[PDB]
């Protein structure tokens, strides 16, 4: 690769609720699974996240 990218926190990390993660994934998968696509093994990563979203949709309250 050779050119690293610099990352700066603009905010301190925030813990998100189980209901936020659940809405984030819906929106993130749907966006990234949308045509006008990019497979590049993201196809399998998404498959994984779908597995994660299901787990959460089952978590209590």
């Amino acid at each position: 690769l050779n050119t690293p990218v610099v990352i700066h926190a603009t905010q301190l990390p925030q813990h998100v609720s189980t209901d936020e993660v659940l809405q984030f994934l819906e929106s993130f998968i749907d966006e990234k699974e949308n045509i006008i696509d990019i497979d590049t093994n993201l196809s399998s990563s998404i498959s994984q996240l779908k597995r994660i979203q299901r787990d959460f949709k089952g978590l209590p309250p």
């Binding site: 990352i7 926190a9 603009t10 301190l12 813990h15 993130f28 590049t40 990563s45 787990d55 959460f56």
Partner: protein, 174 residues
């Protein structure tokens, strides 16, 4: 490092997903000029999604709100801003996982059905018995009293193994 994960509520589980805004200086490709947004995501996408990262010490579940606009009055580089969501389990955390592959000496779990969790024999109850079956192999670990291992297991993180491929959690049922 640690924004400590709060163990809470009625689940006794320690929430590990954190939202993290970050601004980055990316090496845009020539191919993506006039459309850097789609470019930066080939710096973000597969690159990071579902793959552990050290600067934010956690799995990057996905990003939200990519704003390349971090530049606005040729051109190799560019500033952009995004919010990452990160699975950030840390030592000591109390997680929960489904039973994947069990075998005498080392039970295996899948947290949220997608992250590799395993507890060594050492860390197993010791009053838990491992019986072999119609496999020879259908071995399946039943506890003292005698119900075959539940399905979803409680356990405390003892170590998070970051290393090339899938991150792996090393837990203990103390």
């Amino acid at each position: 490092k640690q924004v400590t994960n709060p163990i809470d509520e009625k689940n006794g589980t320690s929430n590990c997903i954190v939202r993290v805004p970050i601004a980055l200086y990316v090496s845009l490709a020539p191919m993506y000029l006039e459309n850097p947004l789609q470019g930066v995501m080939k710096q973000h996408l597969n690159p990071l999604v579902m793959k552990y990262n050290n600067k934010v010490g956690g799995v990057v579940l996905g990003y939200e709100g990519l704003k390349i606009l971090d530049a606005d009055p040729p051109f190799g580089f560019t500033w952009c801003h995004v919010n990452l969501y990160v699975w950030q389990p840390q030592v000591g955390d109390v997680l929960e996982g489904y039973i994947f592959i069990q075998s005498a000496s080392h039970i295996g779990l899948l947290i949220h059905d997608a992250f590799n969790a395993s507890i060594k024999k050492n860390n197993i109850p010791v009053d838990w018995t491992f019986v072999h079956n119609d496999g020879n192999s259908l071995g399946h670990w039943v506890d003292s009293n005698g119900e075959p291992i539940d399905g979803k297991l409680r356990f405390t993180v003892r170590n998070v193994h970051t290393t090339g491929r899938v991150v792996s959690v090393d837990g203990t049922l103390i």
